[PDB]
Amino acid sequence: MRDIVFVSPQLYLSSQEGWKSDSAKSGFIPILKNDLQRFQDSLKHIVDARNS
Amino acid sequence: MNDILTDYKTFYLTHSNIVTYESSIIDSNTFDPILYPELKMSNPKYDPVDWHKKTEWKEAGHIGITTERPQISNSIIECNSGTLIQKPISLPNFRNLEKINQVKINDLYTEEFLKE
Amino acid sequence: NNCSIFVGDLAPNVTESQLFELFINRYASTSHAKIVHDQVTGMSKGYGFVKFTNSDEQQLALSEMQGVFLNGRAIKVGPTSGMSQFIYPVQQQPSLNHFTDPNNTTVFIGGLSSLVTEDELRAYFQPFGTIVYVKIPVGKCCGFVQYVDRLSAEAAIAGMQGFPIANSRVRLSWGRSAKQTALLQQAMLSNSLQVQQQQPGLQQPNYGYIPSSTCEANVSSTMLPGCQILNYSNPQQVIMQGSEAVVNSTNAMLNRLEQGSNGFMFA
Amino acid sequence: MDKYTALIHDENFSTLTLNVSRYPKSLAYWEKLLNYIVKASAPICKSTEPQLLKLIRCTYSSMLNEFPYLENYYIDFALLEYKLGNVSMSHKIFQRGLQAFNQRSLLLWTSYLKFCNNVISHQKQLFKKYETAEEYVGLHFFSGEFWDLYLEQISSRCTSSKKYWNVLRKILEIPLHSFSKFYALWLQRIDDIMDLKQLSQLTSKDELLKKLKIDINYSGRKGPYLQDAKKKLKKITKEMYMVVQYQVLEIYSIFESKIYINYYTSPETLVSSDEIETWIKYLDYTITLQTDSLTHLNFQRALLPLAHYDLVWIKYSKWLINSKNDLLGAKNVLLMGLKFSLKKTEIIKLLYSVICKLNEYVLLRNLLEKIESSYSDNVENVDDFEIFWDYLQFKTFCQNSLYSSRYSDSQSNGLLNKELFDKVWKRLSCKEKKSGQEILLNNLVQFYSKDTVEFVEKNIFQKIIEFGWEYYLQNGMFWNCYCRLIYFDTSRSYLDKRQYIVRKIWPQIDKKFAQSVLPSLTEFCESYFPEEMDTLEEMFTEEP
Amino acid sequence: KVFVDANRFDIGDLVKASKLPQRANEKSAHHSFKQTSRSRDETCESNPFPRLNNPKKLEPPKILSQWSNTIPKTSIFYSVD
Amino acid sequence: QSFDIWKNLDRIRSTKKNAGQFIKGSLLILPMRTEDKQQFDECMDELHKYISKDILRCYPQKEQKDEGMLFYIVLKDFNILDSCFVLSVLLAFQKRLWMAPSEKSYFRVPKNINLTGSFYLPKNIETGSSIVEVGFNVVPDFQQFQVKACHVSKFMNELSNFFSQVEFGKCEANVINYFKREYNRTYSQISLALYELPLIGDGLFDIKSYISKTRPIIETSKAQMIKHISEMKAYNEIS
């Protein structure tokens, strides 16, 4: 699928590999491709509390 | 007893190994010092290992008051219909059908405290 | 009895006050009256229910209001309630003793050796649930253990039965409180009524409380359902369940082991 | 442009998608986003864009993988795939839906069998599927619709008129909620008899000859003979009706008239204290009956509303341990309890003992690796001490499992390992942010040797004296644990350790800091040092 | 989405097709009650706590009226009202 | 009897009444875990020298955790003796690493060890004791079977009495890869659930609306609890 990206915060806030994908994997949330920076800028405080 | 079992679960996991643990496991009373202090927390009596006439079938739905509920002896609620179609099922055997209204109460509060 | 009558085909300018004035205070006493209006428009649909205490007064009101002038039209106050196989089951009552009360959460303990204290008897019945008092009668070799939950009383009776306290087997049953026992002794000395009273409820629903949960000890609570929100204090008030509860309970049990190894408490 | 391109460039869709992907466990956001996607396709058919249908399928798959306990949405997406033409994908959605509750959800079996009444095109396969539903979910209390549907399918498909009698005879012994409809069908089917030879459809002829003293081949005037047959069978049915009526009336009037919610709302919902208590009471009643399919059914029914409250998970795990001696079943219960419960302390603490009883310790190490990697090797700075301490006990057990002993008298090294002591010292250095400080101080003094007590007193306690931190010098329980470490030595005499504790510990502590130490040190001095009471009193008196 | 029988996927178009469009004015002016049509777009945000919004107590298991005289007349627990 | 594997193998070959015939359509899967690989490789090479390639096959993992490996041992079209031999060797080896690191014999089982394990079988079984079935299995297709706390001869006799009563048949061809994908999916779900454990507070529950959704409700519940305590105090008061 074009203009889509599959992502889940359960693998991104835990800082693991394979947290994003373009293909239909079971368990991922489909968001838009141009709004992935808006997804990364939204969870900044949780990553900052995880690192500190 | 809860404090002793919790302190033993604290101490035994920090001062023992699997070589001592696997030799201590016996099958006569299923005794395992990792899991047995957890199950013994709720009840003080605990056995490690004729059901309709015990003191648990009678006061199941309500505690304190005992009753002999009617049941069916040859109950077919567990057998599937793929096995019950193989042969015709016999007549239902009945028991405790003369106590559908009779209930008894072990009244200790009136007999031992009010009437002395 | 609470006999119900269904008035129908009423006018639009007839509120619940006019129906209550026409139903009650006319050779009867209507307990309740409600006109069924629209769900979102607010206007009355022309129908209303009137529930009275006595059936004879409601029957006389339905016989007298059959065709009466009600706001320019008929009243039609015929009864709504009162050969199918399916009927709802009906039951009598067990006359409200202290056994057949589902809200009765206090356990009568007996068979003691007149040797156990109150703090030790608290220590027998502490982890089964939260507790309010552990007072016992003197010279009567018995006591009273009142919880807050009924499942905690079920767990206490299912665990503590057949447990010998101080080389003496226990007898667990149900019972009333001390004031209700004094009232039963005062009513049984003259033998007039000897009636009991039901224990009050909890004013349910109660979302925050989790049954069979104990806590001995600012609070920034997230109120999440997986954890505990509120709890009853151990004497008594209502406490917000914090996160540092198992830590305080562990420090308390280590202090209890340290003070029980020496002999500062027997419980 | 089509509806898909207008759906991408729309302003509301990006905001709803970011609010879903921002908080994934808010089910109302998922439902608003799903309703907006369905509203974006106001005609739903097969002529729409497949590039949007794949997005609908991915959205439903993500919602059903994030929330697998939603009963209605498996039905919704399965009938959506049935609307979109195919039934193999709909059968796969029904199979994963029934697997999400592990074959014990009445609504999914009912909707799948109402679906399968049209799509199976095979009679024996329908009978095997209905018998599977009978042996798994057929003992449900509110299963009147399932058994009405199954008797309807038998009365419509079968022509021998024998299986209907068998299934209805089975239903006349099962405690159902809507049960009197089946008794009324039984009583009007006894009335619908035509001759004596149909009595062999009920039972065998020897059970009629022995128990009821009635013969099938008795020829003569069969009028009052069949009337006496009807009267005696009605009496037996009335007795069994009294038994089942007492059972259903007891279960309703005690238990089932209190539970008002029987569905999975959300992970954010709240269930009242009445309903949790009555689920625990109803399952305590259910364990006593010792009917295994009904017991597992009612435990799954209690996992339906409130699987996040973790009580029924631990209760059903303990039931599988003690009452059945089926402990891998309890292991799978505690494994699935990690996926739903929010208070993951007690389930993981019990699962540790469940794994340790199974003697599968590589699985235990692989499980503890997930905890120590879930914090990215920062387990010493966790707010919840109950997670770290339950990790630390079994990690100390694993370090005693791998490494050999260092000291004498067959004493293996406990918390003082190179991979364990650093994790303790990283937590003890906070002094106000991490709770459970005195728990380690009471649990690092449980070795009782000559060189190991010296090792413990050299690594931490002498280092606290050297740095002079305010929190441990203020607390008297620290010095109580330090005196308990020396006083319970097994190699020294009494006089030397008594002179040690009196002379070289008590003058070292501060006099102005003794206001919080003296309530903790006075108990220790009254405990073990009776003649040293007035000596300690003259050192901490009111005047210089 | 399932039980409302109008937002159903496979047979909802059959419900929405033949409404019996009531070309008589008396058939539309007879009923004066509410429709209570539950739309598909109702989410979990509406009605968060199902016990505060007043539910109904469930119906008792109905029994046969010809065999109603053998009910246990004494209940186990005291039920009020 | 003894503590040797081969003597119990001779005993179970002797008195099991012509147990040389294998089972038509027979399959068994044993997933096991080892800390290290080098000690496992010598025992597995000895097992492949003893057991043929067509009967038993091995499947490694993808090395995702890098510490705990997961190895599938698939016994296909096996006889009753080779199954007992393979399960005895593997159940001895996956516990000898914790109990006896100094014994150093891959085919001699000591007396201090008890055999306790878990093996999967396909669903199409027909049985018409120490080996028990399970309730509430985690695998959709397969059935988990448990053995606990046995000696060598009891393990041999119980496995032979189990496989003499069960009847297999008609297994799916690439069901091994199906079980691999399902097993990896289930344990990736529980690993993600353990990854959700630090993300409880303020992470992904929408706390900003959840506080305001339950702010009057907990206050009214607390007022009901205070009223309950006051009414209980009025109920227990004699006065």
Swiss-Prot record, chain B:
Protein name in the entry: Pre-mRNA-processing factor 39
Residue span relative to the full protein: 505 to 627 of 629
Species: Saccharomyces cerevisiae (strain ATCC 204508 / S288c)
Function: Function prior to stable branch point recognition by the U1 snRNP particle to facilitate or stabilize the U1 snRNP/5'-splice site interaction. Has a direct role in the assembly or function of a catalytically active spliceosome.
Cellular compartment(s): Nucleus
Family: Belongs to the PRP39 family.
Additional record remark: Present with 4460 molecules/cell in log phase SD medium.
Swiss-Prot record, chain C:
Secretion signal span: none
Protein name as it appears in the record: Protein NAM8
UniProt subunit comment: Component of the U1 small nuclear ribonucleoprotein complex (U1 snRNP).
Disulphide bridges, residue numbers: none
Phenotype caused by lack of the gene: Affects the meiotic recombination and the formation of viable spores.
Organism: Saccharomyces cerevisiae (strain ATCC 204508 / S288c) (Baker's yeast)
Top-level taxon of the source organism: Eukaryota
Other remarks in the entry: Present with 1480 molecules/cell in log phase SD medium.
Sample GO molecular function, one term: mRNA binding
Function per UniProt: Component of the U1 small nuclear ribonucleoprotein complex (U1 snRNP) involved in the initiation of meiotic recombination. Involved in the formation of DSBs at recombination hot-spots through meiosis-specific splicing of REC107 pre-mRNA. Collaborates with MER1 to promote splicing of essential meiotic mRNAs REC10, AMA1, MER3, HFM1, SPO22 and PCH2. NAM8 interacts with the pre-mRNA downstream of the 5' splice site, in a region of non-conserved sequence and is required for efficient splicing of uncapped RNA precursor.
Stretches assigned to the RRM domain: 3-82, 105-177
Keywords carried by this UniProt record: mRNA processing, mRNA splicing, Repeat, RNA-binding, Spliceosome
GO biological process annotation, one example: mRNA 5'-splice site recognition
Domain notes: The RNA binding domains RRM2 and RRM3 are required for NAM8 meiotic function. Within the U1 snRNP complex, the RRM2 domain of NAM8 is positioned to bind to the intronic region immediately down-stream of nucleotide +13.
From Swiss-Prot, chain D:
Keywords for the protein's UniProt record, in alphabetical order: mRNA processing, mRNA splicing, Nucleus, Repeat, Ribonucleoprotein, RNA-binding, Spliceosome
Domain of life of the organism encoding this protein: Eukaryota
Primary site of residence: nucleus
CC terms in the record's Gene Ontology section: commitment complex; nucleus; spliceosomal complex; U1 snRNP; U2-type prespliceosome
Repeat (HAT) residue spans along the chain: 7-39, 51-83, 85-118, 121-156, 163-195, 255-288, 290-322, 366-397, 456-488
Gene3D superfamilies hit by this protein: Tetratricopeptide repeat domain
Motif placement: Nuclear localization signal: 230-235
Subcellular location(s) of the protein: Nucleus
InterPro entries for the chain: HAT (IPR003107), TPR-like_helical_dom_sf (IPR011990)
GO molecular-function terms, A-Z: RNA binding
GO biological process: mRNA 5'-splice site recognition; mRNA splicing, via spliceosome
The keyword Nucleus belongs to this UniProt entry's keyword annotation: yes
Stated role: Essential component of the U1 snRNP particle, which recognizes and binds the 5'-splice site of pre-mRNA. Together with other non-snRNP factors, U1 snRNP forms the spliceosomal commitment complex, that targets pre-mRNA to the splicing pathway. U1 snRNP is cotranscriptionally recruited to intron-containing genes. Required for U1 snRNP biogenesis.
Further information: Present with 1730 molecules/cell in log phase SD medium.
Subunit architecture: Component of the 18S U1 snRNP particle, a subcomplex of the spliceosome.
Name of protein: U1 small nuclear ribonucleoprotein component PRP42
Species: Saccharomyces cerevisiae (strain ATCC 204508 / S288c)
Organism lineage string: Eukaryota, Fungi, Dikarya, Ascomycota, Saccharomycotina
This protein's encoding gene: PRP42
From Swiss-Prot, chain E:
Transmembrane stretches, start-end: none
Extra remark beyond the main annotation: Present with 2140 molecules/cell in log phase SD medium.
Protein's name in the database: U1 small nuclear ribonucleoprotein C
Region (Disordered): 21-61
Function according to Swiss-Prot or TrEMBL: Component of the spliceosomal U1 snRNP, which is essential for recognition of the pre-mRNA 5' splice-site and the subsequent assembly of the spliceosome. YHC1/U1-C is directly involved in initial 5' splice-site recognition for both constitutive and regulated alternative splicing. The interaction with the 5' splice-site seems to precede base-pairing between the pre-mRNA and the U1 snRNA. Stimulates commitment or early (E) complex formation by stabilizing the base pairing of the 5' end of the U1 snRNA and the 5' splice-site region.
Family in the record: Belongs to the U1 small nuclear ribonucleoprotein C family.
Protein localization: Nucleus
Organism: Saccharomyces cerevisiae (strain ATCC 204508 / S288c)
Gene: YHC1
Subunit-structure text: U1 snRNP is composed of the 7 core Sm proteins SMB1, SMD1, SMD2, SMD3, SME1, SMX3 and SMX2 (Sm proteins B, D1, D2, D3, E, F and G, respectively) that assemble in a heptameric protein ring on the Sm site of the small nuclear RNA to form the core snRNP, and at least 10 U1 snRNP-specific proteins SNP1/U1-70K, MUD1/U1-A, YHC1/U1-C, LUC7, NAM8, PRP39, PRP40, PRP42, SNU56 and SNU71. YHC1/U1-C interacts with U1 snRNA and the 5' splice-site region of the pre-mRNA.
